[PDB]
Amino acid sequence: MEDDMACVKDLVSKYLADNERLSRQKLAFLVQTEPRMLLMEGLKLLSLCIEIDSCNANGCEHNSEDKSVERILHDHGILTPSLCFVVPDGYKLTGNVLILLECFVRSSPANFEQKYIEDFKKLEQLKEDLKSVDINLIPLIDGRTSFYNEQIPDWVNDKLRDTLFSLLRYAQESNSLFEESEYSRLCESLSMTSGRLSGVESLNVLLDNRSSHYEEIIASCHQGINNKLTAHEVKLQIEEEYQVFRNRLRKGEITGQFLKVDKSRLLNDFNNLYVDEVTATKDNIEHLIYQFKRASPILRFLYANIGEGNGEERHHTIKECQMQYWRSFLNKVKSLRKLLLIFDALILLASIHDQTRHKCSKGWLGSCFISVNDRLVSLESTKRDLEKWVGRRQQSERSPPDKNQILISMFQKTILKATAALKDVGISVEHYKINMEVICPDSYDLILNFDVSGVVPTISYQRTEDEKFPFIMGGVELLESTDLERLSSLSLALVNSMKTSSTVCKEAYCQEFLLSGAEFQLIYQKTGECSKCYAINDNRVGEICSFYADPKRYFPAIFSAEVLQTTVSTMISWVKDCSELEEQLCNINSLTKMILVLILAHPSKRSQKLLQNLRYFIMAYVSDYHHKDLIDKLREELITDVEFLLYRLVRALVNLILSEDVKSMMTNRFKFILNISYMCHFITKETPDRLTDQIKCFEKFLEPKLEFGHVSINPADVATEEELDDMVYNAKKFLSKEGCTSIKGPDYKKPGVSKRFLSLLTSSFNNGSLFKESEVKREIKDPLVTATALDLASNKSVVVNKYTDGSRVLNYDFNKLTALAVSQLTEVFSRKGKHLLNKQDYDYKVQQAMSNLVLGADLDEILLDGGASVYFDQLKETVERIIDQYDMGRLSDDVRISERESNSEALSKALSLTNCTTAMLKNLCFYSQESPQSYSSTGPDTGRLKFSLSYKEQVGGNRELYIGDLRTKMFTRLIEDYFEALSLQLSGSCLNNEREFENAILSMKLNVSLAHVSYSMDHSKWGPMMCPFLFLATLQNLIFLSKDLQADIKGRDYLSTLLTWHMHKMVEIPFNVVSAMMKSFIKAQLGLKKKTTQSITEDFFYSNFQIGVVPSHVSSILDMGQGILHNTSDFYALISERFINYAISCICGGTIDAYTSSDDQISLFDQVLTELMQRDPEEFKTLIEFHYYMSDQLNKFVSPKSVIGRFVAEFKSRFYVWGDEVPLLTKFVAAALHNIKCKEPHQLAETIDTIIDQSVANGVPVHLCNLIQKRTLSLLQYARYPIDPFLLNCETDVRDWVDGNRSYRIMRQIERLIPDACGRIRSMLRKLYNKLKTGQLHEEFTTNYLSSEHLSSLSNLCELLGVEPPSESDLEFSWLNLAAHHPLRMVSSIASGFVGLCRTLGSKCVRGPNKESLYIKSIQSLISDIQGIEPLIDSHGVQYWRVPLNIRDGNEGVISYFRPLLWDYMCISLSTAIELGAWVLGEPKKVRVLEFFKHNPCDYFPLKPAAGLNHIIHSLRRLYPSVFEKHILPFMSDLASTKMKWSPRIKFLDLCVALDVNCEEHYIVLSSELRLSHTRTHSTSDAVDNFMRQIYFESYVRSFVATTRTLGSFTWFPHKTSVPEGEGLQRLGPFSSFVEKAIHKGIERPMFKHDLMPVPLVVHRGGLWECDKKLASFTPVVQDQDLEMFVKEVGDSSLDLLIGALSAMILDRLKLRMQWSEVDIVSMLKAAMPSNSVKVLNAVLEAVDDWVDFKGYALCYSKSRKKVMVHSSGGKLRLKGRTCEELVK
Ligand SMILES: [Mg+2]
Ligand SMILES: [Zn+2]
């Protein structure tokens, strides 16, 4: 701690600015040693700096020696009788008036105002005495809320504050020094405020251990460049480069790289794309449909001819047998945690009785049957075990009873046990209709006397059995919609197959499903979720099919039978008017369907990619130029005998639509093919297998970092010599690319940058030649001036390091790993390896030997003969010497070198070791116990920056993911925020800003409308080809602030340090990758497997495996964070593209505009270039080529999927054409299908609502939306959850979505249920709203009827408004609301989520009155047993109940849930009418007068919907202080030292807030549906005048000085917000120039007389005054309500204040001849002062002495009579030449 005071003494000696006024306290503090002394002196020093700065900023000389105002005046030459001793903190005199001052710091509005009021009273209590010497006092007060002074660099400031706070925390000293009050005040005084800066400057509190390495790096990145060229040499450089490039290209020495599109050649190249196994050139539709319906066993089963033998049994599905009830009962009671045989015999005899009564053949499959737990039960072993068990039972009895009696007696015990066990909570027994006659007299014999017959089915995993199909091949037709529901039922069976638990021939499982009267059984043999074999069976044939599907990946087909049909129908409807296409429409109507079914039968990644890659082809077919390497990118791979059929289908369809016979409609065909391409979303975005996916990522990551040749395996925490050597070497190499003036010429697709072009770019930026005029008038401010960390809490994972000693581990223990690998492989082998030609053929011997080795003589030679001799010996040695140390439990995690943790856990752990218990950034990485002290050029002292690898799913390919630890994320946030703030300055980016994207859309539309050229660009390998070194090398040569060179130099060093920190990172290799590589090495060492590939990433591992060390971490120079350094990369891209456009415009005579986000980009050409395209094609082509080459020279490549055209534009997947519009009808549907989760069923609803709302606004017709909502409701019903009207509304129209919101739709549904009751309610609500908008009652219902029992609220409201209340046969309606007292208890993939939801909503999940646990069935029973309540079900399924109010009481148990419907309807309707407009409360007028017409399906029509914060904040701080201070001040505010005591109020808004605490840029619709809908019948000037009236009102209560701190301290003020140059400058009178010249520049000084066209100004009542003279004035207009608020707030306690103020206002507004006729007085006084207006009336009217006009009268004062006289024609009394009468007699 001594070091603390030492270093802070050094700081305060050094960085304190020279001023003899600080010398005294400087010394007095720089000498003490006792802590308390240091605390006192230091705090006094800080307060001294504060008061000095304040007195400077106000203009009052500093009272230094702490004189007394008595002395201050008497040594100034005046007489003072006697005063109370006061000490001022500054003062000034001006003639006969005086100015004092006092300042302090408080950081809490509660403990703020106290000092304020205390000081004000301390000053007035002296003014009262001063008044008798003819001297005016003006009590100024100032209230700064932060110790951030001005004579001190702020980082020194907090470095002092925190060390003081720490030293002060001596427990014994703190206790035996003071009490808790001042202790608590001080600790919250050193609060570690976020300050006014970034937080990177704090780097100056560490040791700068930079060395020659950093010097070398900087000098190298700064050597050959020249960032000084004038604006005249750049053009010369460019023109010479262009000349050389053009000339050297014409001779055919550089490659073309761009073709011109010829449609026939494109179609040819697409046709024979796979021409090595698709041996054909043109296929026929008939053979296609032929072999389609027979390809795969699933497809074969779908279309076959089943269900023809259907007689009465097709109708015998409802006449249920007792076996069903008994099985359901057994399954329900089983969950209530030998007996299996009891269940078998029970169900068996139940089926026996059912067969003797009606011969129902159900639940029987050949010679087996399903008993309880989805298990298929055989026959013979059941009877065998039952006989042996009854024999053992009777034997143990005899060691007379016959087995029959034993069996008939062993039922009742368990039956009663079950009937009692279920009766723990709720459900009765009388609902499960189970006839007790099951126990027949001759039970045991009749069970022993029952055999059956049939066929025994069995799964087939061998082939040659799936070629003799029982039924006929093709029976169904495509036009119908029959196959879809077959698919639905089959998929439902598959998903349900995941339900079975472990449950622990021999074993099997079965799941039945019905199909058009028939019944089938899907059987399998292993639980859990993983690919396996299934088999379909029936009780008439056997093994219809067998296949190898996967449980999940089959969700999107459930219950979606009509959705897909309507999809295909409305898709075909697009192209049906092309005459040339008519005679083949039927053909099309087939193909589409087929494709869809295929993509839903077998989902697979390869089909997804194949379908996706078609969008680029169709985009190219319409363009003008394209990249020559395009086609080769669309030829990835294909494997099985299904995808080829898909390729042929899509080829036929493409040739059919795009054939060279058509001219009619290109737009519709474009839209059709594009929507076909977007069908890829229907499949899944998950992964087939995880491990084999976790290797392709590593391959992606490692390969480009070997061709460059820079890899450093296993770096250490302290950098050695060789690493730094090669680092500088590679940094030197990177900057040595060349081209176009050389021998070998340019080489494309190689990472690096050329010095010439880099110097050109930097020098071009440093001339202002890249700035638009609107950007050059606004000088670039330094980004250091502006930080919650909760943003970092976004659920992401965080790595946690691992320590063994004072050091941390960064290596995989080699010897420990091979033991784990060998144990794992013997584990996987010993349970499977005995299933081949065993007994020493070639390989069983070796695995058996080395497996017996680990589990606790010829074979030796037979193994070691092949040279695998010494390796085996050393392996045995190491494994036997490592196993002694211990298991599979210890080494399982020791070899692991890291582990993961959630995001909030680590944040809490870190917060527990600091002083500020909040979330600040600069506080968390710089001042804490675990914070570094010194830093080199390779990171801080605690080690270098570390990341870890993972992958991320996506549609199409996959993305990489780097995960760091806490410190790395901290240090990264700073760079990110710096570059983001810097990039906001310039125009063109679209990554974060919105309005830029809007402008991009507008420009795209405008460009397309005129057939101008457009260029759609996407860059390839944006991640692994950038590097932090490039951003560093381009930063050192940049100069933002050209005026001053003193801080930019200071700022850039920090960022150089941080980028250099990033440059030396360390990326960890995952675990499974290492383990798999080790296994493969061990296997291939002896010779066991294929040994064919040996790819580039295996020898890398092997060359280190066979020499000991294992690769653990990898460092290099050639990779930025893939998804880390976004903002900086975006900045670089923006600069680069602007420069390239500048160059191109310099060469030719055109002009280009650009828009970019991070790597996607769109470029719009101009008139001259479009014209040139048609004159000289060669010139245009060579311009494009030059653009390619130039862009390559700056490390920015171009992907072969970029296009140039005149027909279509594209940017961020938002296409555009001329006239028409392009909806992505398939993407949104596929999104909405599989988008359910496991939450409260009242949240899935709102999620689906948001999705459908977003989809309607793009072109999907509402019919599909209704169908989708109905599908979701059916999905809910399948889980047996009662539907209430507050879930969804499957009846919407277009005006419901365009105008209304969720509440409106629900209100509309309720209206639809029960009309003729809502009528009177709307009628009452009309008048209620009309009376509330003027504030008539405004108090009662919000406190009683919105609070008390709403049993008679409506009655009171209707009688209060005088309208007939609702009739009695209305208040019976209700709706069963579960979760009435507490919410429901609910504590990876999509299917698992659905299954979990189903299982959750089947157990105890409702909270009782206080605390219980009940089912849902039990509540059904309870509500059903009462015989007076009648439910009501709608056509869609919505339930609602009717309960009579006579029985509303007496039975308060079950009735505790039901709620009355009309009450909720009224509440919702009122709240909505508040939120939306008032037009809602009209009546629903529907239109139906229309004649049918030809509705062109491609005809759209845009639409826009029909839509003061200061007042909200005012009301919050005025009404709810506790909630306000903790939720608005820390969020974004500092307004503790701000006044608001004169501001208008609103009653409507007030009661709205009281209730609330009590209780979409366009639309694109079809005009075919804007015709069929419903209808419903029927600031800034404010802010400026608010400020003006605030000032005017305060001017009369007292006197206050006019300065930059007095005015800005108020609340109504335009504090440099979004305000133009002249907005309210007319409404400022004598105050216009000051705000601009002083406040709106950042200048803190008082206002002088030279500020109206050396004494400061004084604001008096209305007019401005100097020392005893008035210069000017100002007076806005007043209202009745404003005067009411005035006399409210001023006339509360005192009276003479109100009298004087009113008299003065009347006087000074009369002598200007202003008019008072706009308002009243007497009624105003009464309405304002409801009890004492008379005496104040007399007082004011006696003060004045004249006449005053008002709202329809005029009064005056009399003196002969001491009363007031009204001017009136009926009076007689004389008063100032006017007739008058009295007021009140
Ligand atoms: Mg793009
Ligand atoms: Zn039956």
- The token duo for 765 is 């930026």
Q: How many Cα atoms within 13 Å fall on the side-chain side of residue 165?
A: 20
Residue 1219, Cβ density class (10 Å: 0-12 exposed, 13-18 middle, ≥19 buried): exposed
Q: How far is CA 1754 from CA 185, 627, 1719, 1751, 1764, in A?
A: 58, 89, 11, 8, 11
- The amino acid present at 1491, given as its one-letter code, is E
* Cβ contacts of 1041-1045, under 8 Å, gap ≥ 24: 1041/780, 1041/782, 1043/779
Rounded to the nearest 10 degrees, how much is the dihedral formed by the CA atoms of 1659, 1663, 1667, 1668?
Answer: -140
Resolution in A: 3.5
Distance 1248 CA to ligand 1 centre (A): 29
Report the length, in residues, of the chain. 1785
Q: Which among 1034, 1055, 1050 has a CA at the least distance from the CA of 981?
A: 1055
User: What distance in Å separates the CA atoms of residue 1724 and residue 1716, rounded to the nearest whole number?
Assistant: 13
Provide the residue range defining the domain that includes 1537. 1509-1559
- Provide the pairing of β-strand 97-100 with 136-138: parallel
Tell whether 1301 and 1438 lie within a shared domain: yes
Q: What is the CATH number of the domain that holds 23?
A: 3.30.70.2640
DSSP sequence for 1684-1695: HHHHHHHSSS-S
Q: Which of 1627, 1653, 1675 is the last residue of a domain?
A: 1675
- Provide the pairing of β-strand 207-208 with 934-936: parallel
Distance 1210 CA to ligand 1 centre (A): 6
Q: Check the annotation: does 1160 bind a ligand.
A: yes
Q: Check the annotation: does 1017 bind a ligand.
A: yes
Distance 317 CA to ligand 2 centre (A): 7
User: What distance in Å separates the CA atoms of residue 149 and residue 168, rounded to the nearest whole number?
Assistant: 22
Q: Are 1400 and 1354 in contact (CB under 8 A)?
A: no
Tell whether 562 and 654 lie within a shared domain: yes
Residue 728, in any domain of the structure? no
Matching residue, tokens 């700096």: 49
Residue 848, in any domain of the structure? no
Residue 1664, in any domain of the structure? yes
Ligand nearest to the CA of 1160: 1
Tell whether 448 and 475 lie within a shared domain: no
Q: Are 442 and 404 in contact (CB under 8 A)?
A: yes
Q: How far is CA 1419 from CA 1276, 1428, 1456, in A?
A: 19, 16, 11
Q: Which among 1313, 1331, 1427 has a CA at the least distance from the CA of 1373?
A: 1313
Q: Check the annotation: does 358 bind a ligand.
A: yes
Q: Check the annotation: does 681 bind a ligand.
A: no
Distance 956 CA to ligand 1 centre (A): 16
- The amino acid present at 709, given as its one-letter code, is G
DSSP state of 790: G
Q: Which among 64, 208, 89, 180 has a CA at the least distance from the CA of 140?
A: 89
Tell whether 1400 and 1251 lie within a shared domain: yes
Distance 620 CA to ligand 1 centre (A): 13
User: What distance in Å separates the CA atoms of residue 552 and residue 1395, rounded to the nearest whole number?
Assistant: 11
Residue 372, in any domain of the structure? yes
Ligand nearest to the CA of 316: 2
User: What distance in Å separates the CA atoms of residue 314 and residue 1764, rounded to the nearest whole number?
Assistant: 101
User: What distance in Å separates the CA atoms of residue 662 and residue 578, rounded to the nearest whole number?
Assistant: 9
- The token duo for 763 is 């020098």
- Provide the pairing of β-strand 1373-1375 with 1439-1442: antiparallel
Distance 380 CA to ligand 2 centre (A): 26
Q: Check the annotation: does 707 bind a ligand.
A: no
Q: Which uninterrupted H or E stretch holds 138?
A: strand 136-138
Distance 1159 CA to ligand 1 centre (A): 8
- The token duo for 739 is 């081209």
User: What distance in Å separates the CA atoms of residue 186 and residue 1138, rounded to the nearest whole number?
Assistant: 54
User: What distance in Å separates the CA atoms of residue 580 and residue 1727, rounded to the nearest whole number?
Assistant: 82
Tell whether 1475 and 1592 lie within a shared domain: no
- The token duo for 1645 is 């000084």
Ligand nearest to the CA of 1017: 1
Q: Check the annotation: does 321 bind a ligand.
A: yes
Matching residue, tokens 């961020």: 1212
User: What distance in Å separates the CA atoms of residue 1190 and residue 639, rounded to the nearest whole number?
Assistant: 41
Q: Are 1012 and 1170 in contact (CB under 8 A)?
A: yes
Residue 1037, in any domain of the structure? no
Q: Check the annotation: does 4 bind a ligand.
A: no
Distance 1417 CA to ligand 2 centre (A): 25
User: What distance in Å separates the CA atoms of residue 1012 and residue 1208, rounded to the nearest whole number?
Assistant: 10
Cα 1374 from chain centroid (whole Å): 37
Tell me how the structure was determined.
cryo-EM
Q: Are 58 and 142 in contact (CB under 8 A)?
A: yes
Tell whether 1448 and 1462 lie within a shared domain: yes
Q: Which among 1234, 1227, 1225 has a CA at the least distance from the CA of 1260?
A: 1225
Catalytic status, residue 909: no
Q: Check the annotation: does 239 bind a ligand.
A: no
Tell whether 82 and 187 lie within a shared domain: yes
Tell whether 427 and 359 lie within a shared domain: yes
Q: How far is CA 323 from CA 327, 350, 427, 522, in A?
A: 6, 5, 21, 20
Q: Are 965 and 1117 in contact (CB under 8 A)?
A: no
Cα 1001 from chain centroid (whole Å): 24
- The amino acid present at 540, given as its one-letter code, is R
Distance 312 CA to ligand 2 centre (A): 11
Q: Which among 1383, 1555, 1589 has a CA at the least distance from the CA of 1468?
A: 1555
Q: Are 966 and 800 in contact (CB under 8 A)?
A: no
DSSP sequence for 1380-1418: SSSPPP----SHHHHHHHHHHTTSS-B--SSS--B-SHH
For residue 376, the cross-strand partners are: 370
Three-state DSSP class for 1548? helix
Tell whether 480 and 458 lie within a shared domain: no
Residue 116, in any domain of the structure? yes
For residue 509, the cross-strand partners are: 524
Q: Check the annotation: does 188 bind a ligand.
A: yes
Ligand nearest to the CA of 317: 2
How many CB atoms within 10 Å of residue 1604?
19
Distance 983 CA to ligand 1 centre (A): 21
User: What distance in Å separates the CA atoms of residue 804 and residue 813, rounded to the nearest whole number?
Assistant: 13
Residue 1578's contacts (CB-CB under 8 Å, 6 or more residues apart) are 1478, 1479, 1482
Q: How far is CA 1619 from CA 379, 1138, 1584, 1622, in A?
A: 88, 30, 12, 8
The angle, 0 to 180 degrees and rounded to 10, between the axes of the packed helices 233-250 and 1126-1147 is: 80
**What total of structural domains would you count in the chain?**
7
DSSP sequence for 558-571: TT-SHHHHHHHHHH
DSSP sequence for 1721-1744: SHHHHHHHSTTTHHHHHHHHHHHH
Q: Return the exposure string of 76-97: e unless at least 16 CB atoms fall within 10 Å of the residue's CB, then b.
A: eeeebeeeeeeebbbbbbbeeb
Tell whether 1689 and 1662 lie within a shared domain: no
- The token duo for 121 is 């009273």
Ligand nearest to the CA of 1209: 1
In the sheet with 1014-1018, reading across from the earlier edge strand, the strands are 259-260, 625-626, 1203-1205, 1014-1018, 1160-1164, 1153-1156
Ligand nearest to the CA of 322: 2
User: What distance in Å separates the CA atoms of residue 182 and residue 500, rounded to the nearest whole number?
Assistant: 67
Tell me, letter by letter, the H, E, C secondary structure of 928-962: CCCCCCEEEECEECCCCCEEEEEEECCCCCCEEEE
Ligand nearest to the CA of 1201: 1
User: What distance in Å separates the CA atoms of residue 1469 and residue 1476, rounded to the nearest whole number?
Assistant: 10
User: What distance in Å separates the CA atoms of residue 1260 and residue 1225, rounded to the nearest whole number?
Assistant: 6
Q: How far is CA 446 from CA 344, 348, 413, in A?
A: 14, 10, 21
Residue 851, Cβ density class (10 Å: 0-12 exposed, 13-18 middle, ≥19 buried): middle
Residue 761, in any domain of the structure? no
- The token duo for 354 is 């059912």
Q: Which of 667, 684, 701 is the last residue of a domain?
A: 684
For residue 950, the cross-strand partners are: 961
Rounded to the nearest 10 degrees, how much is the dihedral formed by the CA atoms of 704, 710, 715, 719?
Answer: -140
Residue 1466, in any domain of the structure? yes
Distance 1214 CA to ligand 1 centre (A): 9
- The token duo for 791 is 């943003």
Residue 1545's contacts (CB-CB under 8 Å, 6 or more residues apart) are 1514, 1685
Q: Are 1729 and 1771 in contact (CB under 8 A)?
A: no
Quickly list H helices, 1401-1525. Answer: 1417-1425, 1461-1475, 1509-1519, 1521-1525
Tell whether 1639 and 1702 lie within a shared domain: no
Matching residue, tokens 């060998």: 822
Q: Which of 684, 700, 733 is the last residue of a domain?
A: 684
Residue 1424's contacts (CB-CB under 8 Å, 6 or more residues apart) are none
Q: Check the annotation: does 1018 bind a ligand.
A: yes
Q: How far is CA 1281 from CA 593, 703, 1377, 1397, 1458, in A?
A: 34, 54, 12, 11, 16
User: What distance in Å separates the CA atoms of residue 900 and residue 443, rounded to the nearest whole number?
Assistant: 61
User: What distance in Å separates the CA atoms of residue 1205 and residue 1012, rounded to the nearest whole number?
Assistant: 8
For residue 1766, the cross-strand partners are: 1755, 1781
How many CB atoms within 10 Å of residue 1062?
23
Q: How many Cα atoms within 13 Å fall on the side-chain side of residue 1221?
A: 16
Q: Check the annotation: does 1780 bind a ligand.
A: no
Q: How far is CA 1154 from CA 168, 523, 757, 1182, 1548, in A?
A: 59, 60, 20, 20, 49
Distance 1140 CA to ligand 1 centre (A): 18
Angle at Cα 458 formed by Cα 454 and Cα 461, nearest 5°?
155
User: What distance in Å separates the CA atoms of residue 512 and residue 537, rounded to the nearest whole number?
Assistant: 9
Tell me, letter by letter, the H, E, C secondary structure of 507-554: CCEEEEEEECCEEEEEEECCCCCCCCCEEEECCCCCCCEEECCCCCCC
Tell whether 1426 and 1528 lie within a shared domain: no
Q: Check the annotation: does 62 bind a ligand.
A: no
- Catalytic, out of 26, 44, 92, 115: 115
